[PDB]
Design an enzyme around this catalytic site. Structure first.
Site, short mmCIF file in Angstrom:
data_model
loop_
_atom_site.label_atom_id
_atom_site.label_comp_id
_atom_site.label_asym_id
_atom_site.label_seq_id
_atom_site.Cartn_x
_atom_site.Cartn_y
_atom_site.Cartn_z
CG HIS A 41 0.80 -7.71 1.88
ND1 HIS A 41 0.44 -6.72 2.76
CD2 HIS A 41 0.21 -7.40 0.70
CE1 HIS A 41 -0.37 -5.86 2.15
NE2 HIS A 41 -0.53 -6.26 0.90
N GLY A 143 -3.55 1.54 4.40
CA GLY A 143 -4.62 0.80 5.03
C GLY A 143 -5.66 0.26 4.08
CB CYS A 145 -3.71 -3.88 1.66
SG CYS A 145 -2.31 -2.97 0.97
#
Ligand SMILES: O=C(NCc1cccs1)[C@@H]1CN(C(=O)c2cc(=O)[nH]c(=O)[nH]2)CCN1c1ccc(Cl)c(Cl)c1
Length: 301
Positions: A41, A143, A145
């Site tokens: 993503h 932040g 991920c």
């Protein structure tokens, strides 16, 4: 003595965390040998979130669109590919701090350590369980991920989780390191939600053994139950069924304490039916289900 939520030392994983930026999106990547792994993503844009075609999105990228930084050092991307829901960015430098490692998918009920990271910088380390519904009750902010979960055996890091999303109830979902989601979650915008969850019975029993080893005995009794009768009670209280394999797995703790597993099941039955009557077990007023038998053996005498 004592019993804490204890994570594995994180140093071997810290040396693998990097920052990945594509467009205006920055998240964390895992740098092993000459590959950086991160959530695919990273290539999304908010203007295409319903059904992004990731294959199209990636075809339109070049190596130079990916900015990868390990500390203050920029790593040159020389290849990019997609594997399920992760991106594999080939870089021109092998990570000299690559530990011995494996990619290993875990079972619901297993535990692992999480190294929460922001901008490629590790921030904290804590212990999590994979819930029966395939979510994790993590602690993650914007932040985070690309943060990873892992266990360590001898010198070897078994990576089991990469963080992708926070669900509406505040719990978390992600993939194994081959990019395959845990549970029925997808990296596109939907009304997806955590499914109904259950309590991990074998872990509660393990934790009761931890308590006995640490001197909490008030919940013990002279009674025993049958596996069938206990599982009837388990069903009523939204606990997972106990199998004979669970009983076998609890053997060592049963032997150390001298309390038969089915004896401990009778204690658990009473706790479910009566509560604790104002007492505590290992500092908790609830039944704790996020320690596996292995976790207990690791900390208990
Ligand atoms: O869960 C998200 N958004 C809802 C979704 C939209 C489509 C699917 S889920 C995360 C949230 N997020 C965090 O940095 C963040 C993480 C966290 O744990 N807690 C926290 O407060 N923030 C930014 C990226 N974002 C995201 C964007 C696109 C995709 Cl496709 C995916 Cl999978 C995830």
């Amino acid at each position: 003595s004592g019993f804490r939520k204890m994570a594995f030392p994180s140093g071997k994983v810290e040396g693998c965390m990097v920052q990945v930026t594509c467009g205006t999106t920055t998240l964390n990547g895992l740098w092993l040998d000459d590959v950086v792994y991160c959530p695919r993503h990273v290539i999304c844009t908010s203007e295409d979130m319903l059904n992004p075609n990731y294959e199209d999105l990636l075809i339109r990228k070049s190596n130079h669109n990916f900015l990868v930084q390990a500390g203050n050092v920029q790593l040159r991307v020389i290849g990019h590919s997609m594997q399920n829901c992760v991106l594999k960015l080939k870089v021109d430098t092998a990570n000299p701090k690559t530990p011995k490692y494996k990619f290993v998918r875990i079972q619901p009920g297993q535990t692992f350590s999480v190294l929460a990271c922001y901008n490629g910088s590790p921030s904290g380390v804590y212990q999590c369980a994979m819930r029966p519904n395939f979510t994790i009750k993590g602690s993650f902010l914007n932040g985070s991920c690309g943060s990873v979960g892992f266990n360590i055996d001898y010198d070897c890091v078994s990576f089991c989780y990469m963080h992708h999303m926070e669900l509406p109830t505040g719990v978390h979902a992600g993939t194994d390191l081959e990019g395959n989601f845990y549970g029925p979650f997808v990296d596109r915008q939907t009304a997806q939600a955590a499914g109904t969850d259950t309590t991990i019975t074998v872990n509660v029993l393990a934790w009761l053994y931890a308590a006995v080893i640490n001197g909490d005995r008030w919940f013990l009794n002279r009674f025993t139950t049958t596996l069938n009768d206990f599982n009837l009670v388990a069903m009523k209280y939204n606990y997972e069924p106990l199998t004979q394999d669970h009983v076998d797995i609890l053997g060592p703790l049963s032997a150390q304490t001298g309390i038969a597993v089915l004896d401990m099941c009778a204690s658990l039955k009473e706790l479910l039916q009566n509560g604790m009557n104002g007492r505590t077990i290992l500092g908790s007023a609830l039944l704790e289900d996020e320690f596996t038998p292995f976790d207990v053996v690791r900390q208990c005498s």
